Amino acid sequence: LHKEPATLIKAIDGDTVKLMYKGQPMTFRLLLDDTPEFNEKYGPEASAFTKKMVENAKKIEVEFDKGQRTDKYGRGLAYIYADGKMVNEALVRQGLAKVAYVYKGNNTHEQLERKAEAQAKKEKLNIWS
Numbered sequence: 595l596h597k598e599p600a601t602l603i604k605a606i607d608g609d610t611v612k613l614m615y616k617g618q619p620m621t622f623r624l625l626l627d628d629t630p631e632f633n634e635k636y637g638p639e640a641s642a643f644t645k646k647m648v649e650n651a652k653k654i655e656v657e658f659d660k661g662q663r664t665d666k667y668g669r670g671l672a673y674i675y676a677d678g679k680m681v682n683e684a685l686v687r688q689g690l691a692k693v694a695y696v697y698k699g700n701n702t703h704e705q706l707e708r709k710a711e712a713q714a715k716k717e718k719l720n721i722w723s
């Protein structure tokens with residue numbers, strides 16, 4: 595897997611973000627993550643977390659996995675990094691996302707996110723409180 599550049603166009607919610615990728619606007623959906631929706635519990639807090647992460651970042655990178663790069667809605671499927679820090683994994687660490695939607699061609703950082711989820715749970719953070 596390799597990182598590729600991109601630039602924030604706009605925060606959207608906890609687990610989607612609009613980026614410019616190879617010169618083209620594109621809604622990206624975070625592999626391996628499920629944040630609550632805005633109108634659900636911890637939804638505002640998940641949206642806020644992702645937003646600040648991406649808005650403060652000096653460098654946004656996109657990392658595709660081995661399989662499906664676009665979902666059926668035309669959303670890009672990737673790991674996103676904010677100044678070298680994985681947004682997908684960081685949500686899970688803080689108990690603001692669950693590990694979810696783990697399909698076989700696209701699960702490279704599964705064990706890593708599972709490890710973070712276990713530790714969010716131990717601390718009973720946010721969603722696990």
Ligand SMILES: Cc1cn([C@H]2C[C@H](OP(=O)(O)O)[C@@H](COP(=O)(O)O)O2)c(=O)[nH]c1=O
Pocket residue numbers: 623624625626627628665666671694695697700
């Ligand atoms: C994260 C992810 C979601 N999806 C699809 C499955 C879900 O389909 P359905 O919409 O048919 O339920 C939807 C969940 O996205 P949201 O959690 O953004 O709603 O996006 C993928 O196909 N691959 C993925 O890797």
Ligand SMILES: [Ca+2]
Pocket residue numbers: 609628629630631
């Ligand atoms: Ca969601």
